[PDB]
Design a protein around this ligand. Structure first.
Ligand SMILES: COc1ccc2nc(C)c(O[C@@H]3C[C@H]4C(=O)N[C@]5(C(=O)NS(=O)(=O)C6(C)CC6)C[C@H]5/C=C\CCCCC[C@H](NC(=O)[C@@H](NC(C)=O)C(C)(C)C)C(=O)N4C3)nc2c1
Ligand SMILES: [Zn+2]
Length: 198
């Protein structure tokens, strides 16, 4: 009934993929209880750093990537949810279920990736475990793993970046192409598609 209708919580930044030095590594910045509490209030006072965030809802965890001052992720992870911030929940400024894409204004303190204009097909996929996986671009929205891996290793990395050799953003990881449980290829949202949405 109306009086007891619940509200969905916010997406909460719970960590990041550190790409600042020579070694990529995941960092947790918030534990499960603080995540639950922050999801309900929408108030996250933690300092944000870096380009790739680890984000969570009450039921899912995935990645989000800052490009051109927008923190982007997948609709199948975030739905229409707000994201927690120091002054309360922030409404999405982009939502496109047809592209599996959402975006919020980039958090204060984040750093943004630059959209790639290299036209290169030698890409690198960054996972939630800070693996950097070589991927050969095979089409507008597809690339093949040079070393296929069980889908277990990619689960939870939607919303992460595919990068060019120079570290520019080429796309947002959306889905895995699975044959008998092995990811041989990935699908991504091309950065051009983000730029058109903006
Ligand atoms: C609800 O509104 C929308 C709107 C648009 C939309 N667009 C979509 C393309 C879409 O896909 C669904 C989600 C997406 C997905 O799991 N992504 C991540 C990920 O990590 N998620 S996650 O864990 O972070 C999470 C779950 C918390 C958030 C990267 C993959 C990592 C590992 C793969 C695990 C096995 C799933 C294999 C799926 N692959 C296939 O279905 C392909 N078919 C075969 C046979 O292979 C293709 C892609 C069909 C060819 C697949 O990757 N999926 C299914 N859902 C939506 C929904
Ligand atoms: Zn580039």
């Amino acid at each position: 009934h109306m009086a007891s209708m619940k509200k969905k919580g916010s997406v909460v930044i719970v960590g990041r993929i550190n790409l600042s030095g020579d070694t990529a590594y995941a960092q947790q910045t918030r534990g499960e209880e603080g995540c639950q509490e922050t999801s309900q209030t929408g108030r996250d006072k933690n300092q944000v750093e870096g380009e790739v965030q680890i984000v969570s809802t009450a039921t899912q965890t995935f990645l989000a990537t800052s490009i051109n001052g927008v923190l982007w992720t997948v609709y199948h992870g975030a739905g229409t949810r707000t994201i927690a911030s120091p002054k309360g929940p922030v409404t999405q400024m982009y939502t496109n279920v047809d592209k599996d894409l959402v975006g919020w204004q980039a958090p204060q303190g984040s750093r943004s990736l630059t959209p790639c204009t290299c036209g290169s097909s030698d890409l690198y996929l960054v996972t939630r475990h800070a693996d950097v996986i070589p991927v050969r671009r095979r089409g507008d929205s597809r690339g093949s793993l040079l070393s296929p891996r069980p889908i277990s290793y990619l689960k939870g990395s939607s919303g992460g970046p595919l990068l060019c050799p120079a570290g520019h953003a080429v796309g947002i990881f959306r889905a895995a192409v699975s044959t008998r449980g092995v990811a041989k290829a990935v699908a991504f949202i091309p950065v051009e598609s983000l730029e058109t949405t903006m």
